[PDB]
Amino acid sequence: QVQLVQSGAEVKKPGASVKVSCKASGYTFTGNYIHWVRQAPGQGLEWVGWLNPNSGGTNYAQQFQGRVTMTRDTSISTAYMELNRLRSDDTAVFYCARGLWQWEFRYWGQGTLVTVSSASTKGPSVFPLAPSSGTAALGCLVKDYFPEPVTVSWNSGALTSGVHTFPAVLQSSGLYSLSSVVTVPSSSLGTQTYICNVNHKPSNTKVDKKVEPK
Amino acid sequence: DTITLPCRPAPPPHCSSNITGLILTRQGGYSNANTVIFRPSGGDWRDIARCQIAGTVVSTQLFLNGSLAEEEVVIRSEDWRDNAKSICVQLATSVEIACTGAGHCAISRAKWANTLKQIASKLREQYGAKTIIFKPSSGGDPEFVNHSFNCGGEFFYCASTQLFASTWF
Amino acid sequence: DIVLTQSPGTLSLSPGERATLSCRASQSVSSSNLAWYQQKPGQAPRLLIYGASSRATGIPDRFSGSGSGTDFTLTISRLEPEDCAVYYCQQYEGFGGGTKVEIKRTVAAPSVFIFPPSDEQLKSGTASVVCLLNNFYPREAKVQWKVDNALQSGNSQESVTEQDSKDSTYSLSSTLTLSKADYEKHKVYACEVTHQGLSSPVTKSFNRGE
Ligand SMILES: *[C@@H]1O[C@H](CO)[C@@H](O)[C@H](O)[C@H]1NC(C)=O
Ligand SMILES: *[C@@H]1O[C@H](CO)[C@@H](O)[C@H](O)[C@H]1NC(C)=O
């Protein structure tokens, strides 16, 4: 079966460069062109360029001509895509694709997230969203962390109904932030303990903030 | 006065040929103005074989000792809107490339610019009255990034950078 | 060049009805190079139709394609809840803007909550006021921050969850970000929510310091 496996996610600073790999298997690597498609967060698909693995020839999109370079290594069936002089707006997910004959992209890689930021790895601060005066709402504010992701759990998986963990938003400071909320009965307050479990793998941060009224 | 192309190894004078056609790749993406860019073909041997305007000489980018057009330049392609399909250019008047023997083959500057303007004229009939620009090869292995050819068992690589660097309005 | 315009930007349909996604080309194109894709959140695009009408291997027969010239149509005969994704059309290297197919349900009004900043966060010098909109449909909702009757602008960010896999509702959070100095300069903090499910806009407010 034909499959494409790409390199892992990358965190680069503005002005640096990144190189993404794409290993092919299940077919003759020199028989089909390798394309690359870019997708910015929440945006559409954008074609970057194709590469002929047999000859090494490339055809880059005009908007990427100058900063992109695509090469390959036939002995490992791996294609490469390098993007130099990265900017903040270059944060996107890069896919490598192969067509049935050319453009009918039936085979895609899993994608490679390339985030460009001058921020450093930082753990989040967990602040409570205390309930006040049948249904009451409470939650936790996971603020100022980098990079993504951050997992949230309530009562170590014992409370899942009515839980809403919002997607992170990129603040103007370069740090991410999100909130996790849950609606509970008003009578359950005071008697029932509500713990939000926040984990941040990149910074090895683990916070168990208890949400209380008042 | 002439266009000197660096070649490796040194082609002997008897390997001088007649340029009868080109093979091009239209650069994709979205341009900012009415400009269409062309480069030496970024494909492989399949793009050259399906041209069918070549002779017994095996060459890349430039067709040496091949079929000439009867009256005017004839450009052909399988899809003019598929940038992955090469554009086959067949000249009507051959352009002679003379190799000295010290590692450089010569091409007349004026007679190559005359052929590039006729080529840009035929290209506007397919892509509208726009600005036609020729740019060097986007890269690749030595036999395809350079103008390569065989002659008497040997294989020669000539850098074609100076041949594709003009703008026609 | 070739420009592919997809309409609508977001298509809402009740479960089980027919979907109709159009792809308009700025010029007359050949049907042999029209492709359709499906991309779910967190996944790569999946080829559905190639050559305007040829179905790819493994694709259910409820997907269909047709059209020529400048109009092309992707048809989902019976919309399944698993069919919620973004759909693109392709012409060589050109992609369409994408059409989001979501589930259309009855109007659900949001439950509005407001949370003052915690005293711990005020120690660091920053105040975050959160306005919560819980379980509402449709997605369109207007949230306005007003501090001492002054409409705030440029100091709040919204975040919306994906459509719930069971009730097909959305939840939204609006976070007003102020410093401790400016947060202590005012008394009344309110967010007003205007939604189709509310007979009148709902206001949740509080006084700094109760
Ligand atoms: C092209 O033809 C000329 C004239 O017959 C000949 O001398 C030359 O060797 C040929 N070129 C090649 C590359 O064989
Ligand atoms: C090109 O063709 C002309 C006309 O047949 C001939 O006189 C000339 O020698 C050829 N040049 C080469 C390099 O073969």
Author numbering:
A (entry chain H): 1 to 52, 52A, 53 to 82, 82A, 82B, 82C, 83 to 100, 100A, ...
B (entry chain C): 1 to 169
C (entry chain L): 1 to 27, 27A, 28 to 91, 96 to 213
From the paper:
Here, we report on structural characterization of vaccine-elicited VRC01-class bnAb precursors in the IAVI G001 Phase 1 clinical trial with the eOD-GT8 60mer nanoparticle as immunogen. The engineered outer domain (eOD) germline-targeting version 8 (eOD-GT8), which was designed to activate VRC01-class germline-precursor B cells specific for the CD4bs on HIV Env, exemplifies this strategy. VRC01-class B cell receptors are defined by their specificity for the CD4bs and by using heavy chains derived from variable (V) gene alleles IGHV1–2*02 or *04 paired with light chains containing a five-amino-acid LCDR3 (4, 5, 32, 33).
Two versions of eOD-GT8 were used: eOD-GT8-mingly, which represents a minimal glycan variant of the antigen used in the trial, and eOD-GT8-mingly-N276, which includes the conserved N276 glycan so as to evaluate its accommodation by the VRC01-class bnAb precursors. This conserved binding mechanism is further corroborated by the observation that these antibodies, as exemplified by G001–0087, display similar buried surface areas (BSAs) and hydrogen bond patterns for HCDR2 and FR3 with the CD4bs, underscoring the conserved nature of these interactions across the maturation process. Key interacting residues, such as W50, N58, Y59, Q64, and R71, remain unchanged from the IGHV1–2*02 germline, for bnAb VRC01 and the VRC01-class bnAb precursors studied here, reflecting a highly conserved mode of epitope recognition. All are anchored to the CD4-binding loop (hydrogen bonds and salt bridge with S365 and D368), D loop (hydrogen bonds with D/N279 and N280), and β23 (hydrogen bonds with R456, D/Q457, and G458). The conserved interactions enable VRC01-class bnAb precursors to bind the epitope in a bnAb-mimicking manner while maintaining potential for further affinity maturation.
